[PDB]
Short mmCIF file of C-alpha atoms in Angstrom, two decimals:
data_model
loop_
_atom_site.label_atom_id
_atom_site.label_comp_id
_atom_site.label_asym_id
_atom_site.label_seq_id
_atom_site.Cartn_x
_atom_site.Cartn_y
_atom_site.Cartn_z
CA UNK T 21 1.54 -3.94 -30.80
CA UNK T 22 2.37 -3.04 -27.18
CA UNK T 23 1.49 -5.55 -24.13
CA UNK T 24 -1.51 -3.88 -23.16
CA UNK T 25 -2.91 -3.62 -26.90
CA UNK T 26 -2.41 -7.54 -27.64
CA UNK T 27 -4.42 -7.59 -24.38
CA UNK T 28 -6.91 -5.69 -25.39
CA UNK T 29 -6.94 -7.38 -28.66
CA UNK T 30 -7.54 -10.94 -27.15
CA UNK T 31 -10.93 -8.98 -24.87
CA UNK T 32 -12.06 -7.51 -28.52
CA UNK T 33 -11.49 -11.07 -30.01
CA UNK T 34 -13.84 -12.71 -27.00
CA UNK T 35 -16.32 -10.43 -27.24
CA UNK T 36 -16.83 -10.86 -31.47
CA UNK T 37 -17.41 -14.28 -30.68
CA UNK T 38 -19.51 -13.55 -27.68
CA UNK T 39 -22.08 -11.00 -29.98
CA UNK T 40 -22.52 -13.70 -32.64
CA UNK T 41 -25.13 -14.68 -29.37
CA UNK T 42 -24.90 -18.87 -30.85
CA UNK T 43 -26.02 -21.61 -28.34
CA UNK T 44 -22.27 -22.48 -27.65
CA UNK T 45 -22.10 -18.74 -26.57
CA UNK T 46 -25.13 -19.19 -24.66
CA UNK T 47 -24.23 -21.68 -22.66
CA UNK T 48 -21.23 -19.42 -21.61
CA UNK T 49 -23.27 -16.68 -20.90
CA UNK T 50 -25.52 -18.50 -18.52
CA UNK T 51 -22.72 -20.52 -16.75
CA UNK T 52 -20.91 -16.77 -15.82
CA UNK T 53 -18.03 -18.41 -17.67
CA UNK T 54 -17.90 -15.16 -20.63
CA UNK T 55 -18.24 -12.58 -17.42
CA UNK T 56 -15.39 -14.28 -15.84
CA UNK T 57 -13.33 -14.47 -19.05
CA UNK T 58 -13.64 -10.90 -19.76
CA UNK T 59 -12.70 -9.78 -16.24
CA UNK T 60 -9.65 -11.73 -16.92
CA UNK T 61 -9.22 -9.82 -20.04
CA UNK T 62 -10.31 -6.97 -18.50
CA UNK T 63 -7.95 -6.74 -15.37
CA UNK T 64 -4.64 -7.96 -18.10
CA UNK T 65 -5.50 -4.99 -20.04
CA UNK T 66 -5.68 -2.50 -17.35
CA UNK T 67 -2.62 -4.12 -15.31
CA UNK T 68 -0.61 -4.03 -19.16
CA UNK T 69 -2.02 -0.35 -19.54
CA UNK T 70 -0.67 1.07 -16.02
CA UNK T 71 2.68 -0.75 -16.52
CA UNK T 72 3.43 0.83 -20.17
CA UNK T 73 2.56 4.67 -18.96
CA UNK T 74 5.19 3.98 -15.81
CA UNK T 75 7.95 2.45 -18.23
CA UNK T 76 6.78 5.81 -21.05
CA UNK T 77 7.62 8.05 -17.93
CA UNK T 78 11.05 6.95 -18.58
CA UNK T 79 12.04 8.44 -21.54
CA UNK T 80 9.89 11.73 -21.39
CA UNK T 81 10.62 14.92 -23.56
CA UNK T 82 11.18 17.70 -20.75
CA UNK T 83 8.32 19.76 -21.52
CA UNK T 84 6.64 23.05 -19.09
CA UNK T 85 5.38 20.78 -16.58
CA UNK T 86 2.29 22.60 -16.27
CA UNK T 87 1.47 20.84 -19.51
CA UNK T 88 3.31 17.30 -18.65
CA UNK T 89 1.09 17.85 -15.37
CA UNK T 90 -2.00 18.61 -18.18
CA UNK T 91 -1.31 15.62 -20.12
CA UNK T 92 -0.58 12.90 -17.44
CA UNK T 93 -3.91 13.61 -16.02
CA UNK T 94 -5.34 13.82 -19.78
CA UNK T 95 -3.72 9.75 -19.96
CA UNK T 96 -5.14 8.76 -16.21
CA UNK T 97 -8.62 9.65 -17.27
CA UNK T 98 -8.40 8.32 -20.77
CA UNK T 99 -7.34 4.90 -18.99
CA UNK T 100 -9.97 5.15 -16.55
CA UNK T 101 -12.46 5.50 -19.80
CA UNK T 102 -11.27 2.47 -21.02
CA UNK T 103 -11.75 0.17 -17.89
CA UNK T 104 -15.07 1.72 -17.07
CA UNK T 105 -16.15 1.06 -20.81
CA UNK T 106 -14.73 -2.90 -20.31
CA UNK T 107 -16.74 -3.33 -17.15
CA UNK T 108 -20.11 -1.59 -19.23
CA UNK T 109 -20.04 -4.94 -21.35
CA UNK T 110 -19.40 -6.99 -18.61
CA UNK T 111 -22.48 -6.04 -16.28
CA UNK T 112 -24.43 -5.85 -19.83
CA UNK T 113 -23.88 -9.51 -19.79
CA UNK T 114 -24.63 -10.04 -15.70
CA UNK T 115 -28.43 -8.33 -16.90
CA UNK T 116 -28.08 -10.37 -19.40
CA UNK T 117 -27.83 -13.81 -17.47
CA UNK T 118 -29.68 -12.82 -14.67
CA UNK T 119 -33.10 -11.62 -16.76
CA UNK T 120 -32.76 -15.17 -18.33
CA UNK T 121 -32.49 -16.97 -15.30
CA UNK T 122 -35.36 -15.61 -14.16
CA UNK T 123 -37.86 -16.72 -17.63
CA UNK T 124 -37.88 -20.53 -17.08
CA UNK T 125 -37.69 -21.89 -20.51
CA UNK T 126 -39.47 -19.14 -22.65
CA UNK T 127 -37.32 -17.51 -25.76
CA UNK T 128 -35.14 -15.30 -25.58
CA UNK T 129 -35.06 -14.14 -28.50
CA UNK T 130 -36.08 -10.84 -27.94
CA UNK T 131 -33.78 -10.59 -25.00
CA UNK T 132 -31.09 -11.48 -27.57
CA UNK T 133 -31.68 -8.81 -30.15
CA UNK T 134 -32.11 -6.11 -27.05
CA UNK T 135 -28.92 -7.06 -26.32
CA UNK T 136 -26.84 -7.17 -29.25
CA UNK T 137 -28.21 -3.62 -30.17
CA UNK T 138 -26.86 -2.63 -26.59
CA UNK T 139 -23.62 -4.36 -27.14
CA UNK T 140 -22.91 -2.82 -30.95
CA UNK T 141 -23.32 0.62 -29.24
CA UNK T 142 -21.01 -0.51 -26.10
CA UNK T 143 -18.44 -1.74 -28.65
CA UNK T 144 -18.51 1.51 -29.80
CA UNK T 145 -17.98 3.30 -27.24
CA UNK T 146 -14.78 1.31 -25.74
CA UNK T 147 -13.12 1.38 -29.44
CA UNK T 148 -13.10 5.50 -29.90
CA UNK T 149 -12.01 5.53 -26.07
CA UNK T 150 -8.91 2.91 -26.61
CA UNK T 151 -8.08 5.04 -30.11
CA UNK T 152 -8.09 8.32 -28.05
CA UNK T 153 -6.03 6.01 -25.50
CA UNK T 154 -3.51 5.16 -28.15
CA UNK T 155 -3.47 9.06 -29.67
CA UNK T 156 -2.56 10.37 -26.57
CA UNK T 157 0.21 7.79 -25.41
CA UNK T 158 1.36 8.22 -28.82
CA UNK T 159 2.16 12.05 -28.39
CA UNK T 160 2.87 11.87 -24.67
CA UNK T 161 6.18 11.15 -24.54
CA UNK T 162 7.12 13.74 -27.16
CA UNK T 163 4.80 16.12 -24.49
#
């Protein structure tokens, strides 16, 4: 794949391991280590994702401008769907952490299957925004 889909690939990779919600992930989530990790992933992604579209622009198809105009805004918003949907799980997991913190040593287990319904739906969400992402990058150079 493309830069900014192996990056992508290693923040869907951390975040299967983070839902299987084990003690070793736990711990993670509770030391701020996983929301650090996938900001890392996160901000790679993004910073792969704006370099590709720039080095696309390149080797356009001359089209009627009115629609290259059409379709590089079509690709700026479909990017900004995918960061906002990144940074959705990541302040899922901040909650997360914080409503733990703040239950001294009662279960969470309740908290835990609240939260791994929220993140299947978040999941979701970010992987029919990166394959609309992908469609349109696809077909934008073509116009």
């Amino acid at each position: 794949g493309q830069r900014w889909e192996l990056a992508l690939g290693r923040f869907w990779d951390y975040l299967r391991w983070v839902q299987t919600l084990s003690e070793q992930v736990q711990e993670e989530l509770l030391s701020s280590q996983v929301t650090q990790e996938l900001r890392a992933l996160m901000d790679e992604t993004m910073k792969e994702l704006k370099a590709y579209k720039s080095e696309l622009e390149e080797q356009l198809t001359p089209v009627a401008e009115e629609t290259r105009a059409r379709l590089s805004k079509e690709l700026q918003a479909a990017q900004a769907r995918l960061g906002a949907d990144m940074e959705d799980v990541r302040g899922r997991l901040v909650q997360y952490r914080g409503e733990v913190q703040a239950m001294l040593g009662q279960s969470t287990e309740e908290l835990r299957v609240r939260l791994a319904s929220h993140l299947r739906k978040l999941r979701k969400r970010l992987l029919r925004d990166a394959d609309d992402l992908q469609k349109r990058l696809a077909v934008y150079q073509a116009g």
